[PDB]
PDB file of N, CA and C in Angstrom:
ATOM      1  N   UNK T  24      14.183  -5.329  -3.325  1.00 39.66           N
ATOM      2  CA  UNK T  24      14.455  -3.989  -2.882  1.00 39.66           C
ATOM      3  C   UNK T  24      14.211  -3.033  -4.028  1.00 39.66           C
ATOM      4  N   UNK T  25      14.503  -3.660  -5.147  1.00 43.32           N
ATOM      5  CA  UNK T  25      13.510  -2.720  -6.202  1.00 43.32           C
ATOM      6  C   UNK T  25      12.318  -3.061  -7.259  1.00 43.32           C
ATOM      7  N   UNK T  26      11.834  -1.643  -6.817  1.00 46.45           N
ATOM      8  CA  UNK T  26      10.750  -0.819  -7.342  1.00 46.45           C
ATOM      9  C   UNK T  26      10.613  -0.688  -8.615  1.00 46.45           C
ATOM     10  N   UNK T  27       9.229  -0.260  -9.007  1.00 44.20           N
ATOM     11  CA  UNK T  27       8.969   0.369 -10.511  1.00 44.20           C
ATOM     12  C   UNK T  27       9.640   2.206 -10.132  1.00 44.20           C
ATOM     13  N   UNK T  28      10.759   2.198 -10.929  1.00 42.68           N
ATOM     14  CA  UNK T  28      11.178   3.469 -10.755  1.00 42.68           C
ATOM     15  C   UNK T  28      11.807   4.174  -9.186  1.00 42.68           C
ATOM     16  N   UNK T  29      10.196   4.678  -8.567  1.00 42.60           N
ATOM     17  CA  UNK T  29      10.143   5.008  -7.068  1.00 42.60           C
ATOM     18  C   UNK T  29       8.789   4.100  -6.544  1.00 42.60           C
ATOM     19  N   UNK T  30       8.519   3.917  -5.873  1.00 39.84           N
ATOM     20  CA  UNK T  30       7.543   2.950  -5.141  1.00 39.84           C
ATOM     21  C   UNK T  30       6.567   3.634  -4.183  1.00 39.84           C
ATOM     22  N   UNK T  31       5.389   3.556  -4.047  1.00 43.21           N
ATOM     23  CA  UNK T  31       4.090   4.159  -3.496  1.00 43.21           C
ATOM     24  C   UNK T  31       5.094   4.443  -1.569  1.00 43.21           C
ATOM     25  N   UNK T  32       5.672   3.279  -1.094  1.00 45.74           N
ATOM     26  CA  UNK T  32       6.323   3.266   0.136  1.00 45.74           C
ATOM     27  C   UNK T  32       6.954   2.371   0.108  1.00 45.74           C
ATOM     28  N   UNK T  33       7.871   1.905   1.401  1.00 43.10           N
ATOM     29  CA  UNK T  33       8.501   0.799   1.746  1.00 43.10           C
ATOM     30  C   UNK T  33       8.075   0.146   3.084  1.00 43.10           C
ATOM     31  N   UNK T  34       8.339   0.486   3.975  1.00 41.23           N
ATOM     32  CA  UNK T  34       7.356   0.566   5.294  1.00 41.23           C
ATOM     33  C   UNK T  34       7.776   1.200   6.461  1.00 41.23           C
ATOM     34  N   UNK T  35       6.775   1.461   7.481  1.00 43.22           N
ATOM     35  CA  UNK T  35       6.883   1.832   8.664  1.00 43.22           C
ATOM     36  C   UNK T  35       6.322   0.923   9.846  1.00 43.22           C
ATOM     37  N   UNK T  36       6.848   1.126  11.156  1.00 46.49           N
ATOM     38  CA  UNK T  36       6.865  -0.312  12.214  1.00 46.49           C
ATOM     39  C   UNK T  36       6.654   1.197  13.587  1.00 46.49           C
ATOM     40  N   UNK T  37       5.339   0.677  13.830  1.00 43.93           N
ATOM     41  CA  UNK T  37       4.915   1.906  15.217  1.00 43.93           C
ATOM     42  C   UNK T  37       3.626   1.144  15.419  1.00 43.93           C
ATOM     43  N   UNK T  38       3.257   2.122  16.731  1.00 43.59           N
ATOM     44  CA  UNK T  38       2.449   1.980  17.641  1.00 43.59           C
ATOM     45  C   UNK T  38       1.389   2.935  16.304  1.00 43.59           C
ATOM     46  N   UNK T  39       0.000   2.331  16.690  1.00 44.85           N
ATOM     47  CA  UNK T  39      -0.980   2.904  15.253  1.00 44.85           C
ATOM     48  C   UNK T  39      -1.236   4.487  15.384  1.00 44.85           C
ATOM     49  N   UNK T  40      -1.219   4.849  13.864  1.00 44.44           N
ATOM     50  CA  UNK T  40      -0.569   6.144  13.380  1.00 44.44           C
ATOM     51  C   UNK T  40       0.945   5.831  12.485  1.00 44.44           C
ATOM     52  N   UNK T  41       0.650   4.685  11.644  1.00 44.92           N
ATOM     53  CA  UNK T  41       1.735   4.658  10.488  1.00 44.92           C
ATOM     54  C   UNK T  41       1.664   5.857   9.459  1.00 44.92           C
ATOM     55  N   UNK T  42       2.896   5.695   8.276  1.00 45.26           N
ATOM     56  CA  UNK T  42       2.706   6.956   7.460  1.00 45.26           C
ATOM     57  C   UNK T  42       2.755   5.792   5.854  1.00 45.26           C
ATOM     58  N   UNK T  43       1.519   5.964   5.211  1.00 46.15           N
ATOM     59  CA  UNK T  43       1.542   5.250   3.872  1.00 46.15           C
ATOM     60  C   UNK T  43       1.215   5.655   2.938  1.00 46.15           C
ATOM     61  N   UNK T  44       1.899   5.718   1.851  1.00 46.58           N
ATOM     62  CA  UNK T  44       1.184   6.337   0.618  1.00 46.58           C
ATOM     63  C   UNK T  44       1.138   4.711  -0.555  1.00 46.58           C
ATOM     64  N   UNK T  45      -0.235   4.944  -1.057  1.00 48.39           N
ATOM     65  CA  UNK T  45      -0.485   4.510  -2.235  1.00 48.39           C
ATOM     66  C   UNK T  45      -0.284   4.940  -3.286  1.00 48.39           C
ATOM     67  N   UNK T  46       0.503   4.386  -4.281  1.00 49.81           N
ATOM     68  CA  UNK T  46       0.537   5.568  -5.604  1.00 49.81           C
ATOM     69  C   UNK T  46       0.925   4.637  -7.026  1.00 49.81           C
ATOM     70  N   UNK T  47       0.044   4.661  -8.197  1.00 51.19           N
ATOM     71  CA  UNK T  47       0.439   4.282  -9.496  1.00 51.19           C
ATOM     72  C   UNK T  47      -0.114   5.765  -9.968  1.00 51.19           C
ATOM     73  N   UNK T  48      -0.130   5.693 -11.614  1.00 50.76           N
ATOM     74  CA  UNK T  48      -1.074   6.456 -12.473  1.00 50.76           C
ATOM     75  C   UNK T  48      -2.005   5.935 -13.305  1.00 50.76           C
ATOM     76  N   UNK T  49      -3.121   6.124 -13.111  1.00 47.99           N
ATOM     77  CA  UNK T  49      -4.347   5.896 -13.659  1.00 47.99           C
ATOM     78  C   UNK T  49      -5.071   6.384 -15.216  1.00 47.99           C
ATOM     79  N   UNK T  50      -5.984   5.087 -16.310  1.00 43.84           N
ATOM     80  CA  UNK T  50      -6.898   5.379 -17.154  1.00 43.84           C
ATOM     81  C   UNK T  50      -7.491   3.796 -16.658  1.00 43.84           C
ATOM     82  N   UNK T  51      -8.548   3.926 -17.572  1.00 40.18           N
ATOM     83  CA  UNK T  51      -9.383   1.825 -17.710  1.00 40.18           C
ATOM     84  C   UNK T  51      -8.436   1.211 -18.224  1.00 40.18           C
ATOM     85  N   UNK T  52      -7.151   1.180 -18.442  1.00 40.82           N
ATOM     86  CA  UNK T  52      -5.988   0.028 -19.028  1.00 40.82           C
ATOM     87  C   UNK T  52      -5.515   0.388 -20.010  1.00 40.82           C
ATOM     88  N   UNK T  53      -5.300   1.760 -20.380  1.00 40.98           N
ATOM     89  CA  UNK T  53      -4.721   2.091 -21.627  1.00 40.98           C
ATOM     90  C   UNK T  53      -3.253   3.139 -21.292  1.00 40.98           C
ATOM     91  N   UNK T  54      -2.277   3.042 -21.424  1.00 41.22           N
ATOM     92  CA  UNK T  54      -0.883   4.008 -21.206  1.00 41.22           C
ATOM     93  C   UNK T  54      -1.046   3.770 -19.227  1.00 41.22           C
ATOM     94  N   UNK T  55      -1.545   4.394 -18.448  1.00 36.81           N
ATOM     95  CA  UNK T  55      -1.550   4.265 -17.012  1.00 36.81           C
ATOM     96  C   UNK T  55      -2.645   3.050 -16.980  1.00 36.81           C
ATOM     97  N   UNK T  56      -2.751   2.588 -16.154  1.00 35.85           N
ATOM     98  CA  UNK T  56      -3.389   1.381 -14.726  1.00 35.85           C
ATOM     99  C   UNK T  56      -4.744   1.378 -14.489  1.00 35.85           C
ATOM    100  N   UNK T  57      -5.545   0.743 -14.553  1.00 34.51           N
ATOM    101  CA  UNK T  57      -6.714   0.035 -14.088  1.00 34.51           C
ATOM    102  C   UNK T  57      -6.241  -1.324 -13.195  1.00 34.51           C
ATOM    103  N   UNK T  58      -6.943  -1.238 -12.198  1.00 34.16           N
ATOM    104  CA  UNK T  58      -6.552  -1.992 -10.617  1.00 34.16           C
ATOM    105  C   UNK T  58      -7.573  -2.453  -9.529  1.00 34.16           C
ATOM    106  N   UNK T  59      -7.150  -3.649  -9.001  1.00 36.11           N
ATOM    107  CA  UNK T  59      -6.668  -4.066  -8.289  1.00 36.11           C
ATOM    108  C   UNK T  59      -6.154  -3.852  -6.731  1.00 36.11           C
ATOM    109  N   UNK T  60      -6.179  -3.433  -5.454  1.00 33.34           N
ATOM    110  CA  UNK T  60      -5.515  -2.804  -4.559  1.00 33.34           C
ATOM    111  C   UNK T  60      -5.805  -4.085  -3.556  1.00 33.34           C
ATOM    112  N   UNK T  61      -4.603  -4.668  -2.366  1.00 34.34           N
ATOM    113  CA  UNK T  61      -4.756  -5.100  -1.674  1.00 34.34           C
ATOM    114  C   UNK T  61      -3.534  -5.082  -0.634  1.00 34.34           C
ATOM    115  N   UNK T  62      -3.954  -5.492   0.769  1.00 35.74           N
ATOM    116  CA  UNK T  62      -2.508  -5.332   1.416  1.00 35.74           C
ATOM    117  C   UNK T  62      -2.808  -6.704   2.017  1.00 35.74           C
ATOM    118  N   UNK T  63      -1.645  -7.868   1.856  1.00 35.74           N
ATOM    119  CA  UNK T  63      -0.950  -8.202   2.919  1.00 35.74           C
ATOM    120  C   UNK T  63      -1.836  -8.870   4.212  1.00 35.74           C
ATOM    121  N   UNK T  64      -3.054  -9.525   4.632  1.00 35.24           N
ATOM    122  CA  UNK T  64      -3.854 -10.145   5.291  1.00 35.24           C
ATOM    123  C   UNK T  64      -4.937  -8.857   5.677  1.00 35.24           C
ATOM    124  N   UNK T  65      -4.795  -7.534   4.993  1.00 37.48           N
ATOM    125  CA  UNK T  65      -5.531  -6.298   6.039  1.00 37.48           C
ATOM    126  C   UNK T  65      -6.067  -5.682   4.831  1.00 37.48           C
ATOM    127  N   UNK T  66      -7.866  -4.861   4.815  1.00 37.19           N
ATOM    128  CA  UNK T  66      -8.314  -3.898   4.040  1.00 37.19           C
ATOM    129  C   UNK T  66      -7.693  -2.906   3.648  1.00 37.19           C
ATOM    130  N   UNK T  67      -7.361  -2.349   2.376  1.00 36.84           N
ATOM    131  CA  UNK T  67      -7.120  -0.940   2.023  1.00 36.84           C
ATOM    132  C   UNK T  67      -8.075   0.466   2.027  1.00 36.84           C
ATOM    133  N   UNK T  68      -7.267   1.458   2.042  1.00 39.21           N
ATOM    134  CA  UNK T  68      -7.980   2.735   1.961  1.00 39.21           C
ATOM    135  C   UNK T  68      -8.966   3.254   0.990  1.00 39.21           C
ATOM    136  N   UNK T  69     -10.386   2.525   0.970  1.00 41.19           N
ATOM    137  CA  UNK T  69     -11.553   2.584  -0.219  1.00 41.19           C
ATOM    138  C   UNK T  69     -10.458   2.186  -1.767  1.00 41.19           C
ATOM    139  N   UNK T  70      -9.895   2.418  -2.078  1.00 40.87           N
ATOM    140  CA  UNK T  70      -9.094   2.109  -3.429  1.00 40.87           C
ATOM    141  C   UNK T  70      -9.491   2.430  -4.894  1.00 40.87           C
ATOM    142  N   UNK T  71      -8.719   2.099  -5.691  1.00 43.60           N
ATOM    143  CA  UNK T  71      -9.021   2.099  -7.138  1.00 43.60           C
ATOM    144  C   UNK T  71      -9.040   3.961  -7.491  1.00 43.60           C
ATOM    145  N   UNK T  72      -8.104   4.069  -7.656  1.00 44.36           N
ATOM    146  CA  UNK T  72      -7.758   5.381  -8.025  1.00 44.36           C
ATOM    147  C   UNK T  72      -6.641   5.922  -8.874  1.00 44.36           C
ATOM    148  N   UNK T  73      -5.456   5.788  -7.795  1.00 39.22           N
ATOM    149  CA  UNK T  73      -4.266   6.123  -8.466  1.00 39.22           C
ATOM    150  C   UNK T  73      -3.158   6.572  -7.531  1.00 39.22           C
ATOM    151  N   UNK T  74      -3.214   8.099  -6.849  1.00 37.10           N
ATOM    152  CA  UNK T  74      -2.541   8.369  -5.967  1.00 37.10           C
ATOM    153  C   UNK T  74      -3.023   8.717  -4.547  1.00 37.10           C
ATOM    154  N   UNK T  75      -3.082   7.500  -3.125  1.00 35.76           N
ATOM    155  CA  UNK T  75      -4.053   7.685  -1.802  1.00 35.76           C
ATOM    156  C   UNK T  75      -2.839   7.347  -1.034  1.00 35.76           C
ATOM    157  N   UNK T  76      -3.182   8.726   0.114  1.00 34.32           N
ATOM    158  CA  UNK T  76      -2.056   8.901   1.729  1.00 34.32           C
ATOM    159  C   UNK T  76      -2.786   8.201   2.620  1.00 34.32           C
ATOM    160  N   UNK T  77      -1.880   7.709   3.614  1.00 33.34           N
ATOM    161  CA  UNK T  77      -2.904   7.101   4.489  1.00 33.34           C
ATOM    162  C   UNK T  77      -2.070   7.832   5.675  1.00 33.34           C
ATOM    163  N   UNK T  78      -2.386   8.862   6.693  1.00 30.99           N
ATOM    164  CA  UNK T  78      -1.163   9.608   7.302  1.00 30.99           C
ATOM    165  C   UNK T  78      -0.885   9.354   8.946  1.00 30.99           C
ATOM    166  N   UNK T  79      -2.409   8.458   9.089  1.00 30.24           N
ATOM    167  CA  UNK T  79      -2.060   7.687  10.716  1.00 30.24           C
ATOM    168  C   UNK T  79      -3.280   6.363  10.353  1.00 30.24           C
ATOM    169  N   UNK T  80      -2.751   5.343  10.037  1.00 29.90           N
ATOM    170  CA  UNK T  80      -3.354   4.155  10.143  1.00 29.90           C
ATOM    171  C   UNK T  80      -3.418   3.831  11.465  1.00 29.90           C
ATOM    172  N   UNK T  81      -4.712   3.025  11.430  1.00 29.18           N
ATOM    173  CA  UNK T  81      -5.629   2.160  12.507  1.00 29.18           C
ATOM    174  C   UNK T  81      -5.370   0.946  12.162  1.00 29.18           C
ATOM    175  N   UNK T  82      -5.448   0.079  13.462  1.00 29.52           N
ATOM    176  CA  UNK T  82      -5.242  -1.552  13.549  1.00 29.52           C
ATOM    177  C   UNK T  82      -5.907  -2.212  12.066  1.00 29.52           C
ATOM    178  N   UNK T  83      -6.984  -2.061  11.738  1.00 28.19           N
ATOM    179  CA  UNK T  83      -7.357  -2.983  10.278  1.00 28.19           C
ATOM    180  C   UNK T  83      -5.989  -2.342   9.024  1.00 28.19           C
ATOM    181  N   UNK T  84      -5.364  -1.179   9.453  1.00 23.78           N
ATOM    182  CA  UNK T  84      -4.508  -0.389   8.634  1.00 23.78           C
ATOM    183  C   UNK T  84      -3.143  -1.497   8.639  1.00 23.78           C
ATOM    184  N   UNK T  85      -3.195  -2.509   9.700  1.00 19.98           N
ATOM    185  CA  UNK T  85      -2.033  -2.821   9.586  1.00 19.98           C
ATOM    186  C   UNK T  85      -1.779  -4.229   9.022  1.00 19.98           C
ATOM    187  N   UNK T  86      -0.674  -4.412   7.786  1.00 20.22           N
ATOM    188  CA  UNK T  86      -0.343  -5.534   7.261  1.00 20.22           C
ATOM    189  C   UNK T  86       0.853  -5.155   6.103  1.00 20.22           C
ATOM    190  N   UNK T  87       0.877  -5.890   5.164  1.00 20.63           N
ATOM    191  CA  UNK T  87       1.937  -5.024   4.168  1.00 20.63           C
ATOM    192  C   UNK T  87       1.176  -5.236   2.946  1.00 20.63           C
ATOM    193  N   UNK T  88       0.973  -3.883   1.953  1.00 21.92           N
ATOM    194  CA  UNK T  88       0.181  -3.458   1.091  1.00 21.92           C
ATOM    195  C   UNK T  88       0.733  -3.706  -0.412  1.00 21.92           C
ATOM    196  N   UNK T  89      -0.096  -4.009  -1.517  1.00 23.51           N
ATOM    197  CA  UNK T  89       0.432  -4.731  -2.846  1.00 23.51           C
ATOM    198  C   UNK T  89      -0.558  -4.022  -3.895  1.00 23.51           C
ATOM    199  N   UNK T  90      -0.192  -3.977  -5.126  1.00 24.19           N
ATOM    200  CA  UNK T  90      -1.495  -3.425  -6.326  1.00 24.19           C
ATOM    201  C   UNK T  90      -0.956  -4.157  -7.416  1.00 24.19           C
ATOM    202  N   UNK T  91      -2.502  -4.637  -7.814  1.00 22.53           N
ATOM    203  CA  UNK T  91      -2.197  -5.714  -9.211  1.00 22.53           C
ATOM    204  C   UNK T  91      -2.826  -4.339 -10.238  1.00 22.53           C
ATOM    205  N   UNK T  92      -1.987  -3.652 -11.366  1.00 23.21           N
ATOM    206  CA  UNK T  92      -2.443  -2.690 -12.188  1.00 23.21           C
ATOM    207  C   UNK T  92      -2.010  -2.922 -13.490  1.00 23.21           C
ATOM    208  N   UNK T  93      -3.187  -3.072 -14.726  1.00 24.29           N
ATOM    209  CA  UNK T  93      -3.142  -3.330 -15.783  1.00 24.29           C
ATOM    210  C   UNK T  93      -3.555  -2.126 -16.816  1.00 24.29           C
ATOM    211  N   UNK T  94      -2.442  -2.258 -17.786  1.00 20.25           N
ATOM    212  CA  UNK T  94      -2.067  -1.171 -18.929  1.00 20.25           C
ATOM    213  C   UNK T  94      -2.114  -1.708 -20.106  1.00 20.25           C
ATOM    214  N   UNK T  95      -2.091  -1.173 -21.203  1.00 19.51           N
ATOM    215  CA  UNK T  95      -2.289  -1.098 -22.960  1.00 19.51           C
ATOM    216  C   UNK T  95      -2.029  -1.829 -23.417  1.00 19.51           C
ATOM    217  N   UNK T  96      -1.119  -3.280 -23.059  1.00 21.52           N
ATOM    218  CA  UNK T  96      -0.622  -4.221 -23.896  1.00 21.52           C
ATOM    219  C   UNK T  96      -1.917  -5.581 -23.352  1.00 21.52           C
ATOM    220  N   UNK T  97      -2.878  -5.158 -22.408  1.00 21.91           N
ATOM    221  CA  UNK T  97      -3.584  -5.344 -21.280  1.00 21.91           C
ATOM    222  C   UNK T  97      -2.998  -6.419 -20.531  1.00 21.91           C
ATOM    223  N   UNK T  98      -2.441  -6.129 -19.845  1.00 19.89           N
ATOM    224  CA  UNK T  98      -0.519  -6.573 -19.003  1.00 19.89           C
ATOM    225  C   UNK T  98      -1.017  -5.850 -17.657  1.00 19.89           C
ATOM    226  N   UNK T  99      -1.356  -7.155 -16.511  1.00 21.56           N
ATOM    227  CA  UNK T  99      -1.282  -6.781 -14.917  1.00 21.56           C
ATOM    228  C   UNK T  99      -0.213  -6.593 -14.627  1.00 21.56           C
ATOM    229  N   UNK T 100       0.346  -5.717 -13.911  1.00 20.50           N
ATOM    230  CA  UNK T 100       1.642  -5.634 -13.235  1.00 20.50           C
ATOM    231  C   UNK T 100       1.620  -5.500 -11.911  1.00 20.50           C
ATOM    232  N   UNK T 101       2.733  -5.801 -11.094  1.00 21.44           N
ATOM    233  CA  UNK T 101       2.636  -5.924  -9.620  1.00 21.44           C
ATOM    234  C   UNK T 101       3.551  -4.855  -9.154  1.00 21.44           C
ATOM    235  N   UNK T 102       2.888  -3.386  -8.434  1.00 24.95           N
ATOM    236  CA  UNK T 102       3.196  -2.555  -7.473  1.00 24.95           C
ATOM    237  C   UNK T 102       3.553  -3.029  -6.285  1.00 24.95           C
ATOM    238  N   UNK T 103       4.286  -2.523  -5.696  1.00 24.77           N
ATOM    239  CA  UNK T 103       5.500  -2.728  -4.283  1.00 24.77           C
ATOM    240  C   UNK T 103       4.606  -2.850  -3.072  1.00 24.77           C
ATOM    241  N   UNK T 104       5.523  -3.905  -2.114  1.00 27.68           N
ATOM    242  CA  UNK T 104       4.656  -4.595  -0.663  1.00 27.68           C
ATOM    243  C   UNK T 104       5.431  -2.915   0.142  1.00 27.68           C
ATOM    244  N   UNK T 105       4.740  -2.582   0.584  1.00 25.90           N
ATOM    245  CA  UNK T 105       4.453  -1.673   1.621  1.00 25.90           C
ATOM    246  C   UNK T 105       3.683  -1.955   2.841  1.00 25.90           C
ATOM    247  N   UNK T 106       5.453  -2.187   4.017  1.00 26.08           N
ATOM    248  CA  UNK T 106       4.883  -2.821   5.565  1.00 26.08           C
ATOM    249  C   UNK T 106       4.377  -1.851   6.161  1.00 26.08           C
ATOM    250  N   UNK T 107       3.283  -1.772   6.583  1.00 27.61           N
ATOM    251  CA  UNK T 107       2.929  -1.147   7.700  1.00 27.61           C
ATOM    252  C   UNK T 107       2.541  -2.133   9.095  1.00 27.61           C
ATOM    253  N   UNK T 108       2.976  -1.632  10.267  1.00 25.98           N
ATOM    254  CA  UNK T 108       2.851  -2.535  11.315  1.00 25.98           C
ATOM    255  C   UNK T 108       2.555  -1.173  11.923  1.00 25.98           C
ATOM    256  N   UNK T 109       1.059  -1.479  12.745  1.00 22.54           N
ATOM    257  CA  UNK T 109       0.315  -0.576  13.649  1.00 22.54           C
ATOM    258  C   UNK T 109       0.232  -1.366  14.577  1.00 22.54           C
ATOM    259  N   UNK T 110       0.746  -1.376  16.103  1.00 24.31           N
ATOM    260  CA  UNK T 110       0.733  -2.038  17.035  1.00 24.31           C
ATOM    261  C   UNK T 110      -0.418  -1.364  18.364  1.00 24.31           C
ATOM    262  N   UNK T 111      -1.075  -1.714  18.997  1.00 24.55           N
ATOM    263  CA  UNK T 111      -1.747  -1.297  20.263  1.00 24.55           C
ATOM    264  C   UNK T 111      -0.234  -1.267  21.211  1.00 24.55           C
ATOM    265  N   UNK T 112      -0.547   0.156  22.690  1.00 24.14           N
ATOM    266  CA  UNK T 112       0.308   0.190  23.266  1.00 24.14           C
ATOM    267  C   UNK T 112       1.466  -1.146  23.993  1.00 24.14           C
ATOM    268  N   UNK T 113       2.269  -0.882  24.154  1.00 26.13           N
ATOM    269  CA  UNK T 113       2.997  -1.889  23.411  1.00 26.13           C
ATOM    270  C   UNK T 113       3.240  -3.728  23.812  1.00 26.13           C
ATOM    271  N   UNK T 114       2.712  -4.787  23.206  1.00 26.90           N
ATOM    272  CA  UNK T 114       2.683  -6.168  23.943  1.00 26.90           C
ATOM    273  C   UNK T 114       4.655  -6.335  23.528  1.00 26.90           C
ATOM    274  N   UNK T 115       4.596  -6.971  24.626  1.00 25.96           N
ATOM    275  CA  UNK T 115       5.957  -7.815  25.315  1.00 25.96           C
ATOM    276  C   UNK T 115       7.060  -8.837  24.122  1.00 25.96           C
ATOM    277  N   UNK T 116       7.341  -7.369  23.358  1.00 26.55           N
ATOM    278  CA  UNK T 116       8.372  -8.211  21.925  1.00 26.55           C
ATOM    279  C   UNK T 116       9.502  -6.936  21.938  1.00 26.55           C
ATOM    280  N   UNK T 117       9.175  -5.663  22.258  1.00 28.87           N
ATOM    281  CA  UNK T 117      10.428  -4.249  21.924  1.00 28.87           C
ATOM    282  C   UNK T 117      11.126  -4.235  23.220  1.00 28.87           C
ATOM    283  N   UNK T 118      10.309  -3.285  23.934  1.00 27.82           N
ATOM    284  CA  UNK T 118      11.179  -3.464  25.829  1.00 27.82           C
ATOM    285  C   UNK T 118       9.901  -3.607  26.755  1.00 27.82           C
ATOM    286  N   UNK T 119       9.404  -4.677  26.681  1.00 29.03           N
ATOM    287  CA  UNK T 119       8.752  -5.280  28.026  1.00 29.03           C
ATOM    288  C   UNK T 119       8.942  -6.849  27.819  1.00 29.03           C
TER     289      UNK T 119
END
């Protein structure tokens, strides 16, 4: 349950149109992050940046999201799983 500090997200559970933010701070591995971006069995949002919204994810949008980001001591570190679950209208698990 904890984070580096505050954490890019934690997650959201809907019909697709989740709300996600990606977020470290960025250089090539010196004081901020050079990276890594992946989620959870599903593609990320183009990547390798630093700070990316994702403000209504689509079905490939959905899985739970992770970042391997390496800094000055040249030390990977592991950024926070962020669930997103984007469901099609709704199959027979909430109320049907």
């Amino acid at each position: 349950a904890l984070t580096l500090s505050k954490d890019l997200t934690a997650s959201m559970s809907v019909e697709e149109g989740a709300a996600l933010t990606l977020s470290v701070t960025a250089t090539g591995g010196t004081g901020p992050y050079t990276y890594a971006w992946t989620k959870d069995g599903s593609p990320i949002p183009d990547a390798s940046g630093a700070t990316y919204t994702k403000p209504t994810a689509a079905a490939e949008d959905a899985g739970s999201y992770k970042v391997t980001v390496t800094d000055s001591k040249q030390v990977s570190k592991d950024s926070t799983t962020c669930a997103v679950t984007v469901n099609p209208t709704v199959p027979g698990g909430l109320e049907h």
